């Protein structure tokens, strides 16, 4: 058969997804333990640190669900950055079969992270419902739209970093080190309402803060949002980053093969 390019793209994506799941979850599936252990540890540490402070801050929302709704999307974003950025060197020897373009590695890692964090999110809402908390969003498709925007922004940033830092295998550590204060500033542990206003506009430069707040607002009933937080700014950031990443990949397409 002629086997049109969409067919071989499906085939290489499927095979590469199997190959990459065999190592991401680890041999004998030991990694899934840590995968569902990490949010539990985060929840425990943050709740026994700040439960009374969060209760005094806003009493309408209980702490664990407010933690989950900003924690799991950020975990998906962090995975889609760090796991995606190192997608080149892990399969460098694989670039010798003419249907193994590096964009397939990027897409395979992105879809694996997306699926894993989707199952983790569903398990988290199931547990939260099982413990008597509030676990059904009021505006579900708006939440899906903000989640899709966050996913595509993270995938674009991961592809951009993987393209840029190919000749330079370093600066990946600096990417993770810079990702840590992004966790500490995007309001994923404490509500951002208590932040003094003089620091407020600078913190609005981070699009992840906007996406987290918009995902939280469409989840809870009657959750206020600050002025200056919108969807247009993170959407434009994501679109421009995706365009830049695809253009940079198109420039140096041949150089990603050794």
């Amino acid at each position: 058969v002629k086997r049109s390019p969409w067919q071989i793209q499906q085939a290489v994506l499927f095979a590469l997804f199997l190959r990459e799941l065999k190592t991401r979850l680890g041999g004998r599936w030991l990694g899934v333990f840590w995968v569902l252990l990490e949010p539990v540890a985060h929840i425990a540490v943050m709740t026994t640190l700040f439960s009374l402070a969060h209760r005094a801050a806003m009493p309408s929302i209980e702490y664990p669900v407010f933690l989950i709704t900003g924690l799991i999307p950020f975990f998906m974003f962090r995975g889609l950055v760090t796991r995606l950025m190192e997608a080149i060197d892990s399969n460098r020897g694989l670039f010798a079969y003419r249907q193994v373009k590096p964009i397939d590695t990027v897409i395979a890692r992105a879809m694996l992270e997306i699926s894993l964090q989707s199952i983790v999110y569903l398990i988290a809402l199931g547990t939260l419902g099982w413990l008597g908390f509030h676990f059904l969003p009021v505006r579900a498709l708006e939440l899906a739209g903000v989640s899709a925007v966050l996913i595509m922004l993270g995938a674009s940033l991961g592809l951009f970093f993987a393209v840029v830092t190919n000749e330079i295998p370093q600066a990946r550590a600096i990417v993770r080190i810079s990702l840590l204060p992004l966790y500490f500033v995007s309001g994923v542990i404490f509500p951002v309402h208590t932040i003094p206003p003089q620091y407020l506009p600078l913190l609005q430069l981070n699009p992840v803060l906007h996406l987290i707040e918009l995902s939280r607002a469409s989840f809870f009933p009657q959750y206020r949002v600050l002025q200056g937080i919108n969807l247009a700014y993170p959407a434009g950031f994501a679109l421009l980053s995706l365009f830049l990443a695809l253009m940079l990949y198109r420039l140096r397409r041949h150089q990603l093969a050794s």
Binding site: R28, W29, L30, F33, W130
Partner: peptide
């Protein structure tokens, strides 16, 4: 709550089975 207690006991018992089976297989 009989059914609720049975369900959460079932879940934990399966989890316990999963972890002990995984470590007893990976020790080999």
């Amino acid at each position: 709550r009989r059914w609720y207690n049975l369900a959460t006991l079932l879940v934990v018992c399966c989890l316990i089975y999963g972890v002990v089976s995984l470590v007893v297989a990976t020790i080999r």
